[PDB]
């Protein structure tokens with residue numbers, strides 16, 4: 001809608017960057033095309049399409065309007081075949097904002113290389129859950145989003161921690177606005193599994209081996225959460241929702257200029273959710289606050305200061321899964337889905353806060369530089385108490401394990417990078433050169449020396465959580481871990497021919513972990529990045545890539561000789577085809593991929609049967625593993641009012657024994673989520689459905705009372721979602737979400753410490769949203 005503009009005549013490059021900023025729109029243009037040209041003056045309250053054609057007056061440029069993006073082109077009478085993947089400079093470093101796009105497909109993305117690229121231009125599997133997708137299906141936290149992310153499987157550790165797999169691996173890489181956090185373990189990682197979506201525009205998941213921008217990390221993927229940003233027009237909304245099991249959510253979101261000119265701009269969001277659960281005596285209060293201010297120091301230098309805060313505060317937390325698999329005498333336990341082995345007072349509260357500042361500067365070069373400063377906190381307060389072990393006994397009694405972990409992780413990050421174009425052999429290429437530093441410091445107390453506790457409960461079958469709370473005693477342990485990451489990276493994107501784009505880059509990494517454990521060090525480790533994209537038609541491109549990653553091992557993972565295993569490492573080999581339709585409104589991708597892991601930690605059963613080094617009592621073995629698999633996806637417009645996100649993923653991951661592994665992650669999965677906006681009489685009704693299918697999944701668990709391995713199978717099952725919204729009013733709308741329509745009873749965990757967890761039964765959510 002009508003925006004306040006003030007772009008005086010200047011280098012067309014600068015004007016377009018200035019335009020993107022003022023218009024809250026992503027401008028994409030070609031550097032060689034705008035380099036010898038200037039904008040004409042625009043001033044005053046204008047609609048952005050009126051504004052841009054006015055700005056482009058005299059330049060010979062055309063505008064392609066595409067959602068929250070505009071691409072500028074300068075057509076010639078010549079042209080010998082179009083350079084679809086031509087180097088393009090961009091006004092927003094993080095990509096296209098999805099908020100208001102009305103789409104389930106992203107516009108442009110920087111998750112791969114820092115370079116702002118379309119999914120079609122990216123030689124990696126990149127899925128995105130867009131703002132609209134999130135709104136439509138009421139995906140209100142990262143757990144919700146993951147569950148709806150094609151190619152991801154969400155499994156439960158416990159009531160307050162989920163696992164996200166991709167391609168055989170737990171994902172343990174989280175970024176915020178393209179900045180990695182430290183996720184060495186749940187110490188550093190509190191709250192990552194729980195982020196509320198109220199503050200985010202989209203989550204982008206980069207599958208494979210993502211060392212280039214993550215640095216040290218897990219295989220599988222990176223989850224990159226892009227924060228909402230301030231807008232140049234005032235706008236906001238209040239949201240209210242009510243769902244099954246006393247699930248209440250409220251939300252506020254306010255954005256706009258804070259001065260008459262618009263040179264300081266802010267966005268604030270507050271969200272609160274208090275919910276019970278299908279699980280007995282489990283409740284959780286979550287709170288989020290977020291403020292961000294953008295100050296324009298001048299036309300081409302912006303300072304951003306922001307803070308965020310999320311508290312996740314549950315009662316009846318489990319330690320491991322909802323119930324034990326086997327009773328005292330070896331039979332499978334058969335319990336309702338409402339069973340919760342958590343004690344009433346058991347709580348794994350997790351909290352997170354960020355304070356962050358950026359400085360962004362556009363150089364009249366068409367280059368941009370950006371400094372990102374982060375202070376992050378991941379805190380936990382975890383007095384846990386849960387039935388665990390082989391229970392009940394015949395007399396229907398059980399025993400509780402109780403331990404308390406409190407702690408905080410303080411983190412500091414500096415990221416500086418420079419990105420821009422450059423001529424070489426007559427053609428335009430682009431480059432990112434960057435450097436990064438993070439220091440993160442974990443400090444905690446643990447308590448396991450319970451003083452005078454009677455940890456037995458008299459009634460398992462009617463377990464309520466109604467057990468006493470122990471005297472925790474004095475601290476049993478003081479955590480003091482310190483992780484230091486230093487990185488330097490460079491990626492070039494050479495426009496080799498009119499259809500060929502070659503990506504060559506890498507990261508050099510310095511990783512130090514210091515504290516109570518023997519010091520872990522890796523210096524000057526090189527992480528290569530090699531990719532190619534070949535254009536086939538106006539529509540299809542093929543791409544191939546070789547990417548890598550490592551994670552220095554947990555310090556308990558030592559070997560036969562008490563030497564720390566070499567870092568857990570992997571390369572992803574990928575070849576595939578990407579299609580782009582309707583001017584980027586619909587994307588399809590088909591990929592074959594292979595992850596070769598090496599130095600994957602493993603028990604070492606032959607040593608461990610009778611240790612022979614007094615030095616180590618429980619060594620680990622560092623083996624190779626492989627993931628073979630393929631993936632198909634589609635997202636975007638299928639017809640005018642009709643959006644989808646869908647995916648198909650096949651995987652098998654075997655280790656150096658040849659045995660299948662991550663067998664709780666199904667070998668085959670399908671996701672399809674769709675919504676349809678009607679026209680004419682009922683153009684105010686959005687109707688929507690979704691399905692998730694997954695094939696066989698199983699776990700080998702040991703039945704202690706019978707001294708034997710058992711197989712726990714989860715037969716293939718569907719989950720069906722349904723969704724409807726009515727825009728009753730310009731400013732007010734109502735929604736219903738029904739999840740798991742057929743009330744499929746299934747498991748999200750079998751075998752995590754000999755326990756099991758159910759997935760959500762049929763639940764509803766009703767919401768109204770009020771836009772000012």
Ligand SMILES: CCCCCCCCOCCOCCOCCOCCOCCO
Pocket residue numbers: 234254255256257258265266267268290291292293305306307355
């Ligand atoms: C050093 C710590 C950093 C703290 C950062 C906290 C930032 C909190 O800022 C919240 C302000 O957000 C502004 C909300 O935007 C609404 C603008 O509308 C104001 C009134 O509108 C006038 C008429 O349109």
